[PDB]
Design a protein that fits this description.
heterotetramer, A: mainly alpha, Delta-Endotoxin, domain 1, 9 helices, 0% strand, B: little secondary structure, binds fusicoccin, binds chloride ion, binds magnesium ion, Single-stranded DNA-binding protein 4 (chains B, D), ubl conjugation (chains A, C), phosphoprotein (chains A, C)
Chain lengths: 235, 5, 235, 5
């Protein structure tokens, strides 16, 4: 890889610089280089990895949605404009799929296998579910049902671990549950499952806030608010 | 807007 | 080029799709392909070209500024963190310079030479001034003074044309003057020139609004507000 | 913020 000649510490340092400069494509490249050094990531390093690709793929998804909406309208009294909209949507889609494939490959080589602590293992399985979910969002062929099940299977293993090993207010446990509920609602055609999961997740975290130190769980509160937002939109 | 994290 | 096999009309169509999806790097690639077909750009096509590279280079500049600020602080009681900040700032800087070189090459081959109508000629000379200005913003070696003068020379020729051929409320004439005043203030160490130019530009456009149709000059009003904003900040 | 266009 192009990052093979750079020191691991320098990759991590430059990923944090790229984060400050909102250069997320660079940030993702540096963290991919860091993973490929073969050592496990620390808690802070896992966050750099996930934030980088979340933002890269986030922009691709938003652009794919714009184009796919234009494409849908073109297939409704709509004038034939030729192949250009489909071509450009496919271009963006193929690039999106390539980023998802890259992330999934990294998790498979060798983040998931080497993760023993529950936090890291749930973290990486959540990521695996997310990037299979993004592949599902654009899937339309024979593989859609298989891609959906790959996301479910990853999310479910993460869920089983998080309930056995983590407290209900753990931010990774909460964020896994948020995204699995989003999976149920938007991908798996299971809005009732999505709603039940978001509600029990929110309720069980509320009941456990009393154990927590002030100012130590700002991320958990943010996620609980996202659960509450989704429930308000869904009910 | 459905939110994820 | 990679766009050589695509029809000119399809490039223009896909540039407008990329604009709607805020994929400005793609937008710039499509419009570069369109220019390289060898035909002149229409008024609408010139706007697609300038908006695309304005946004690409705009992000690079913002990121360069973040990194250069971190670098400056590192050279103030500051701990030696090694070469990584300079390396990453140089990486972003070199990429920025490559985009500016690409734009300047397109203007030189062959947009400026083939432009006869005043609007297009002033438009392309403004662009030439802008991208030499962006090279000046990061220049620190022997070439800085030469790069500054290349921007001045381009802006000045545009200015001479716009005053002879265009009305004071023409949006291209106004935007040229705005950016030349920014050049004076931020690049050429000439704040008094910047202020005088912004004031006479604003005043002469105000006195000519009476000739204009309602709702036909929203872009001119926006630029006049930007002139007013700069003057408020500068005085 | 100095503005350009
Ligand atoms: C990119 C790294 C930076 C910006 C340095 O840190 C990102 C964030 O990293 C941590 O927060 C994580 C985290 C998020 C928090 C919810 C953000 O919290 C606040 C108040 O801003 C969003 C990020 O994307 C990140 C890393 C993602 C995950 C998500 C990843 O799944 C694979 C699961 C849930 C969430 C967990 C890991 C959060 O703990 C921290 O606990 C946050 O600090 C505070 C005050 O809460 C910090 O903003
Ligand atoms: C990318 C193309 C799109 C979004 C379709 O159009 C961009 C814009 O293109 C035109 O506006 C131009 C234009 C700008 C206007 C000031 C924006 O006006 C409003 C009210 O939004 C900003 C753009 O960057 C653009 C193309 C740039 C130039 C600038 C280029 O120098 C080489 C010189 C001044 C300015 C001129 C060319 C403006 O005429 C139009 O007159 C604008 O329409 C209105 C209602 O004013 C439209 O928003
Ligand atoms: Cl395409
Ligand atoms: Cl670098
Ligand atoms: Mg080493
Ligand atoms: Mg496809
Ligand atoms: Mg042809
Ligand atoms: Mg340099």
């Amino acid at each position: 890889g192009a990052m093979g000649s750079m020191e691991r510490a320098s990759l991590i340092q430059k990923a944090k610089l790229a984060e400050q400069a909102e250069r997320y494509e660079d940030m993702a490249a540096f963290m991919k280089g860091a993973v490929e050094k073969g050592e496990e990531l620390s808690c802070e390093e896992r966050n750099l990895l996930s934030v980088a690709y979340k933002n890269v793929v986030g922009g691709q998804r938003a652009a794919w949605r714009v184009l796919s909406s234009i494409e849908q309208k073109s297939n409704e009294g709509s004038e034939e404009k030729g192949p250009e909209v489909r071509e450009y949507r496919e271009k963006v889609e193929t690039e999106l799929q390539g980023v998802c494939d890259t992330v999934l490959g990294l998790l498979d080589s060798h983040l998931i296998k080497e993760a023993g602590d529950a936090e890291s293992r749930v973290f990486y399985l959540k990521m695996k579910g997310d990037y299979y979910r993004y592949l599902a969002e654009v899937a339309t062929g024979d593989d859609k049902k298989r891609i959906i099940d790959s996301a479910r299977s990853a999310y479910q293993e993460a869920m089983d671990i998080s309930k056995k090993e983590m407290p209900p207010t753990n931010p990774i446990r909460l964020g896994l549950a948020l995204n699995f509920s989003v999976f149920h609602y938007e991908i798996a055609n299971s809005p009732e499952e999505a709603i039940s999961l978001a509600k029990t997740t929110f309720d069980e975290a509320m009941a456990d806030l009393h154990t927590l130190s002030e100012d130590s769980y700002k991320d958990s509160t943010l996620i609980m608010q996202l659960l509450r937002d989704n429930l308000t939109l869904w009910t | 807007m459905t939110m994820s994290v």
